[PDB]
Point group: C3
Chain length 336, copies 3
């Protein structure tokens, strides 16, 4: 493309929405390539991540853990204005795994408190991709303090199965999974710290054990359960995007399946089918497509069940509709 | 199918056999869909898992760790009579990853001691699938106490490679891999308990380290060696089903390969080929197909070699037949 | 083939080179099957694995960690002369995951100090494959002491993508990733040992935690950085072979991708495409193919970033050439709000 051609492309501002929700978009690209414009403000803030009042000094894109899902189409440009308010204490940047060059954008986006930057990259590859902060000399600490999210680069013609049949979802959720490493005193009580930097040395010690104290969805134990369960109806087609910026995970829909799973997250690699449990390596995003067939409460988990039910990696779906006795039936209910 | 149509289908009662053996079945489906009937009694028993006399309070489907492999074909119905004897102390249930609805059957099969239940589900998706117990509030504890197995849902026309060529095995073995988390006293000696519930609190602390004390096949270190080594001959086609309900594994046949590997365990997902070491995520089953070409002793391991040779994850195959010097020869035997 | 037909085949003696470099070879096979001959001497040697001077008594094929990459084509015979010099103290052997029978060759290559052996096998399956020592009773200790490498069995017609299109690399690197388990004292400082045997019991304890103290490329923290960084140019096609004989890894090129990735390492299994981060399970090798599009520094890491940046699993590429502002541009450089 010529300089004038790039310059002439339409520019569109998109307002972001907090996870697990996803901003309005079209599955099939509406017209030619665009420069899609997003803005995110970085917030350093204390968050509580469990029922014991455990604190983390979060580093949060757009104020959330994970950061929001940005959606564009292949060969669009993504143009991010990233803002680091003067009230923050650390330099921050952004690495888009979807982008090509300068450490994914990290080398071009180092902003001190009181600074902003604008990065544009061409989204040449279709898929879901991780993004994360990566300040040289403290990369893992930034990432495991929650400074990560994902984007989706849809094929211009939307999603398809391995045989080129269209796969069109009715809704989409983004589940960001976070490993946290919270220091404890010798009595086993989680420690609290006045300033983010104060926790650095104690936290790295925990990190080096490679054993998270908490593994959570949407930034806290139980964030996506109970009255915050995700929703669907029988017959509804749902895409579940799942990311993990630092550590492996194995998602599983209890009572369901991944009908089509782009386990690697890349849409030019044909999806696996009929999956019980899929695998997303640390530093990647994946996506599963499922049509609900049964009503009721589902759990959606990391299928290391210790991580799911002891460490926090469990969400719910509440699904409306009619029960299908062909698929499953209690022939004899639990009885003496 | 309507209730009436289901009621009219032929019934077939199957008698289960202890792992690693697999009950009598046909690879190609005999006739139209049927209701395949299985019965399992839950046994809570002490198992010894290593040569140091270390004990686990097992929770065992059909009295074994893993539970037995159930084999059906796609679009058959699997009808399980699950029995929880008065000699047990805990509520138990079953989640079939192969099933659709009610948390894989777990919501509909909660049986107190002295109770039984019958669940029927349509096996709509072909592949190997995990099944496991999942009592709300105690899910990981049930699973890592050995309450898990697998089923195989064969395609009605049997197995095929990625290009439609038939793959027919002569032998089939089922390896269930188990991560155990056994508490230790202050001298590093493993603890013994006189009732299952007594170990709970201590065990949860070990589980939270995400570091198993033992990783075993068929419920114990060395279980599938010696009297229980798997057997074959040169020229024989062998299918090895492998499950792990809670934790990742990486199977490898030492001296062999996985000629065809359904690493995700799902038969509509084309198999990988010529594998050295495959990968099965926690909460899943996989299957490898191999034609033996050399006689001798083989080891079959989780290829984290610490897990294989320090923690217990190693089995043997004993293979009869003629040595093939074209494939491999000692040109100069070890010498000065 | 018969003994006689194999005897008639041409021989090719190859000189191995140290990782991350790879000995001269042809992507598309030159002529018919050959017996390709390699020699490696095993060295039990003290090595330094980080900038602090932490020592490990390594067990090293050809004196390097990892051992060197051997390259043959499908249905060639690989013929290895393996030597265990009298200066060593342990029995050693070799298991080629590429080979069929006798525990990958381990059953036939058990050599005490002062012994040698010659093993030949037919490389029947195309792909990259781990090889490693495996003395019964001491298997994981040998492997996590650095005694492992990889081989590449190219298809006779070179590489192709999943749809038959030829993929020809301009250069190839071999990154061997090593998990080390180094005992610490009550200060938390790494211990040093006079003899390899002295370290055994303390090391097995660390191994049991399943938590390495170091996770490194080419035998040490920072080994593939500075004047030892890998290099490329804009437009250059690079194959990166990556192995891990004992523990999972998740490779990622920061600023790039794996355009085609044989994540399982086996060339008859079609590659994944457009990968951000791929996965290679412990006991396997994988390979990624990438065409560089942008100049500058890249890091190549295990994307458990704690492993990458705290434990040592990070390498650098330095890439020359002209920057592409279409692909990426700083619309507004960091500046005051
Ligand atoms: Cu990254
Ligand atoms: Cu499950
Ligand atoms: Cu091996
Ligand atoms: Cu940051
Ligand atoms: Cu149970
Ligand atoms: Cu050795």
């Amino acid at each position: 493309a010529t300089a004038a051609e790039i310059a002439a492309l339409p520019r569109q501002k998109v307002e972001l929405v907090d996870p697990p929700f996803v901003h309005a978009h079209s599955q099939v690209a509406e017209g030619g390539p665009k420069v899609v414009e997003f803005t995110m403000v970085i917030e350093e803030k204390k968050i509580v991540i469990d029922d014991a009042g455990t604190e983390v000094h979060a580093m949060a894109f757009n104020g959330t853990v994970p950061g929001p899902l940005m959606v564009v189409h292949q060969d669009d440009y993504l143009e991010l204005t990233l803002i680091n308010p003067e009230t923050n204490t650390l330099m921050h940047n952004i690495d888009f795994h979807a982008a090509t060059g300068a450490l994914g954008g990290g080398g071009l986006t180092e902003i001190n408190p009181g600074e902003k930057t604008i990065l544009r990259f061409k989204a040449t590859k279709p898929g879901v991709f991780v993004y994360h902060c990566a300040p040289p000399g403290m990369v893992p600490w930034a990432v495991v303090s929650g400074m990560n999210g994902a984007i989706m680069v849809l094929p211009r013609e939307g999603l398809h199965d391995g045989k080129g049949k269209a796969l069109t979802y009715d809704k989409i959720y983004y589940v960001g999974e976070q490993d946290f490493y919270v220091p404890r005193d010798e009595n086993g009580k989680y420690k609290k710290y006045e300033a983010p930097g104060d926790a650095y040395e104690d936290t790295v010690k925990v990190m080096r054990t490679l054993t998270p104290t908490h593994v959570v969805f949407n930034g806290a134990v139980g964030a996506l359960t109970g009255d915050k369960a995700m929703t669907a109806a029988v017959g509804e087609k749902v895409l579940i995007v799942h990311s993990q910026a630092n550590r492996d995970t194995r998602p599983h829909l209890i009572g369901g399946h991944g009908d089509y799973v782009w386990a690697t997250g890349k849409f030019n690699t044909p999806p696996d089918v009929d999956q019980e449990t899929w695998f997303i390596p640390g530093g990647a995003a994946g996506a599963a497509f499922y049509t609900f067939q049964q009503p009721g409460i589902y759990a959606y988990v990391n299928h290391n069940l210790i991580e799911a039910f002891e460490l926090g990696a469990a969400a719910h779906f509440k699904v409306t509709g009619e029960w299908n006795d062909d698929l499953m039936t209690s022939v004899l209910a639990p009885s003496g």
